[PDB]
Amino acid sequence: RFVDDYLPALLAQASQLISSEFHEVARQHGFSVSEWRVMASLAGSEPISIGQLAQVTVTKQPTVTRLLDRMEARGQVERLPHESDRRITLVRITRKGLKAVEHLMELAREHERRVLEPFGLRRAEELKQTLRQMIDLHV
Amino acid sequence: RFVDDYLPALLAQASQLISSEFHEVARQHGFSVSEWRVMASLAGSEPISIGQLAQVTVTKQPTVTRLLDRMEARGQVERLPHESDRRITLVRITRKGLKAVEHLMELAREHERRVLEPFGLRRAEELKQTLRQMIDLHV
Ligand SMILES: O=C(O)c1ccccc1O
Numbered sequence: 001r002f003v004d005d006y007l008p009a010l011l012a013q014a015s016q017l018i019s020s021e022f023h024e025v026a027r028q029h030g031f032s033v034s035e036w037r038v039m040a041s042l043a044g045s046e047p048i049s050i051g052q053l054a055q056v057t058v059t060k061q062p063t064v065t066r067l068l069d070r071m072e073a074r075g076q077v078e079r080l081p082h083e084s085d086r087r088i089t090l091v092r093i094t095r096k097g098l099k100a101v102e103h104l105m106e107l108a109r110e111h112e113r114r115v116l117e118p119f120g121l122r123r124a125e126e127l128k129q130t131l132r133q134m135i136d137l138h139v
Numbered sequence: 140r141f142v143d144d145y146l147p148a149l150l151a152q153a154s155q156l157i158s159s160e161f162h163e164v165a166r167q168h169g170f171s172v173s174e175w176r177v178m179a180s181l182a183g184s185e186p187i188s189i190g191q192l193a194q195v196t197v198t199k200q201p202t203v204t205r206l207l208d209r210m211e212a213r214g215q216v217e218r219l220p221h222e223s224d225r226r227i228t229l230v231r232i233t234r235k236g237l238k239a240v241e242h243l244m245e246l247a248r249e250h251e252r253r254v255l256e257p258f259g260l261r262r263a264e265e266l267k268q269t270l271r272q273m274i275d276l277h278v
């Protein structure tokens with residue numbers, strides 16, 4: 001059966017199952033999926049471009065732009081000009097956004113620890129290294 | 140930076156980048172993303188439930204049901220009753236659907252081979268085994 005060992009299908013199913021588990025927690029804490037992805041991706045970051053944010057959150061750029069409109073209205077993020085090119089808008093999390101998401105981020109780390117514990121440290125680090133290398137080759 | 144090593148973010152980005160590459164090919168062959176996922180997931184399968192199809196194609200069940208309405212109208216799939224429980228509808232690919240997708244499936248196998256070749260057979264099989272185990276634990 002073709003799909004049983006087809007890498008893109010395996011990645012898509014694993015990603016959906018793992019992320020959907022945490023989504024229930026995020027909503028119980030008042031976050032939508034996309035709000036969580038944006039704030040988690042900006043936490044601890046220097047300002048990044050809207051395009052970079054769209055890539056890392058796996059969200060279409062027009063969707064991200066509308067999302068940032070409302071999150072900036074709520075004081076959770078800030079958009080800023082690029083210091084050279086003004087094709088580029090940069091975005092950062094605010095202190096208000098960080099305080100809003102830090103507890104959820106701890107719960108996310110615990111969730112990931114539970115997901116990876118059956119595989120052991122070696123298999124977990126191998127998985128993360130392979131995924132990171134794949135991203136950097138394909139982005 | 141939290142997101143750089145957060146497993147769900149790594150899985151989601153890797154899956155998006157790898158699948159989006161093949162999507163351009165699928166569309167050039169007349170398939171939408173969801174049509175491709177359905178036909179690839181049914182190819183070589185015994186009939187499966189609509190819920191199973193929704194899980195493996197990572198598509199919401201109401202979306203899958205509308206998709207099957209039109210794909211069955213086009214003679215590419217067939218819905219059938221479960222031989223015991225009639226809460227359950229089963230679905231299979233037809234010969235017409237298989238012939239429609241088999242060339243695309245060969246191109247998909249070549250694409251996967253290219254994606255995995257830099258990692259080698261050992262790292263590739265490790266990745267697939269880990270993803271399969273994760274799916275089976277979380278489904
Ligand atoms: O990403 C794919 O190409 C795919 C194909 C079949 C089933 C699920 C999938 O994600």
Ligand SMILES: O=C(O)c1ccccc1O
Nearest residue numbers: 019037040057147148151
């Ligand atoms: O799936 C997640 O939880 C996630 C979080 C941050 C960025 C991208 C993501 O897919």
